[PDB]
Design a protein around this ligand. Structure first.
Ligand code: CO
Ligand code: CO
Ligand code: CO
Ligand code: CO
Lengths: 328, 328
């Protein structure tokens, strides 16, 4: 009945309206090496993060899960300052970024020592139950991710460690999938290893526009997240994301099938980029103009209500699902 | 006449006896994410590093080049504290780790933005001429590395940026080669982009055991470094490295061939590992039993003198070559 937040344990019944995937700070691994030209401006960053939090609060949001991975600039103390300033509950994660073009050598080195999976498991337990770094702050979720079209051997170490930690703690697992792939594979692999489907959120499911893919994932009993609202088409340099229009189409088909108790919604904003600032060129910026923490509320919700979605169903997704997810 | 150290500019004539590649601190990229169970032990680390510096001083060493890359735990403030304490000159680097399993998310994102190569140049220039972070410390070398059998695209950006920065500043370039490949190609590539061979050290050359490969590299006018004495066979569990007896055989062929003015020697020790402590299994710990900062002086040099290597040849390598390398 409690969940760990950056301000300590909070009753799950008090989380209220929740955004399941948003980043106050985020940096792509490697940002740390660009410290000279890409210094962290903590005061200015706290201001921007506090403003983002207040914009969420504008729409009744009481809780945010910020699943920034350990190698992507996760900063629990900074998050505590945001929470203390705004009264928002913020839940952070323990986890590493997916492999990408290739695995970082640290845990690859330890795999060759034969201890990597055990070390990762130990990291998860420490961070879920003892405290992160120089603080007593505990993570409330394990963050996993897989690559496009495969869960790599590197990534599987974290999946196995997460299932183990999940069994010991009852902690929630949040994932990120790359380019609308591996949703069924993620669920199947975690479930093979004894993870509880009612404690799993398969992320970035909005990146696939085929409801049959969503149904194949939903059949495992897991939650899914349409968590990149506002990231449209070629707006971000990485991939080609779907449009919001396509997300909404996909979502409405699932809500019409009555899957509302398995779906959560978010934007995956990055409110402060770590490392050196950058700009997007004119036409793509236009594609990203709605990528902000209010978008779901001021744009997506009214579209859904005009399409016949009731407040009961919306509140199931924003309130009921997070409460169930984080409950025993 | 001057080189930037962690204690500011120092006359090159005062560097004296030098180790061209040793790490006080090092961690594999990713170590930062394992901070909870792999804390930086500030007290113990300074003790172990200061001691390492004392051991080097005891065999006459006055200067150490510590080329720990930016993404591998480079900490110029900490190195300054070691220098302020022991009087040892420490020269640090600006650069990133090699690909090899895949480019890190950060400069890969920037590569997609199209600004990466320029950002890297800008970083080099800033860290060579202005200061690293808030430390006021300037790097005295640019550190580059390439992958096995190939200089990749990610890698070439750093090579071209280094050539460019070397032209502006006259800074020294130190490289690392992976598993005895690409020595000639590194040299060729840098020179093709305007770099000065008298300011380049091609490293880990001891990883190759074919003197033809060395001669091909030496033909470009660059320095080469046998800089991994003590790292034997499969001891570092990732890769296969030569034995020291293979290094000596190779080195003797080159010394017989009168190459002393282009050769430097080192151990590439890691005196404090960043991230979580670990233990090498007992077969590999044996292979590595000589990997420490005194190995050259108590074991390798004696062996060389017994095969007729003269004091003035050794002094050319440890004293004259660094002096020439850092001189305009
Ligand atoms: Co993600
Ligand atoms: Co995210
Ligand atoms: Co190296
Ligand atoms: Co090294």
């Amino acid at each position: 009945e409690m969940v760990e937040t950056v301000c300590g344990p909070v009753p799950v019944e008090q989380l209220g309206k929740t955004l399941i995937h948003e980043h106050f700070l985020f940096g792509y691994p490697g940002f740390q090496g660009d410290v000279t030209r890409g210094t962290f401006r903590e005061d200015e960053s706290l201001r921007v993060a506090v403003e983002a939090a207040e914009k969420m609060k504008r729409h009744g949001i009481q809780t945010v899960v910020d699943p920034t991975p350990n190698d992507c600039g996760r900063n629990p103390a900074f998050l505590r300052r945001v929470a203390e300033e705004t009264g928002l509950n913020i839940i952070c994660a323990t986890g590493y970024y997916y492999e990408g073009e290739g695995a970082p050598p640290y845990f690859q080195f330890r795999r060759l020592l034969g201890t990597a999976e055990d070390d990762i498991y130990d990291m998860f337990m420490a961070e879920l139950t003892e405290g992160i770094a120089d603080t007593g702050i505990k993570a409330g979720v394990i963050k996993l991710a897989s690559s496009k079209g495969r869960i790599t051997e590197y990534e599987k170490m974290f999946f196995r460690a997460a299932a183990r930690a999940q069994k010991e703690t009852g902690a929630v697992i949040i994932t990120h999938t790359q380019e609308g792939t591996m949703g069924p594979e993620q669920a199947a692999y975690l479930l093979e290893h004894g993870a509880d489907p009612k404690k799993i959120v398969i992320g970035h499911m909005c990146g696939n526009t085929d409801p049959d893919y969503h149904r194949k994932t939903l059949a495992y009993g897991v939650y899914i997240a349409f968590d990149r609202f506002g990231i449209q088409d070629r707006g971000m340099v990485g991939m080609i994301a779907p449009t919001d229009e396509e997300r909404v189409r996909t979502l409405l088909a699932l809500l019409r099938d009555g899957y509302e108790k398995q779906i959560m919604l978010s934007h995956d904003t990055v409110n402060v980029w770590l490392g050196r600032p950058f700009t997007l060129p004119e036409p793509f910026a236009e594609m990203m103009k709605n990528w902000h923490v209010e978008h779901l509320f001021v744009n997506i919700i009214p579209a859904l209500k005009n399409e016949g979605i009731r407040d009961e169903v919306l509140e199931q997704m924003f309130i009921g699902n997070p409460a169930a997810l984080f409950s025993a």
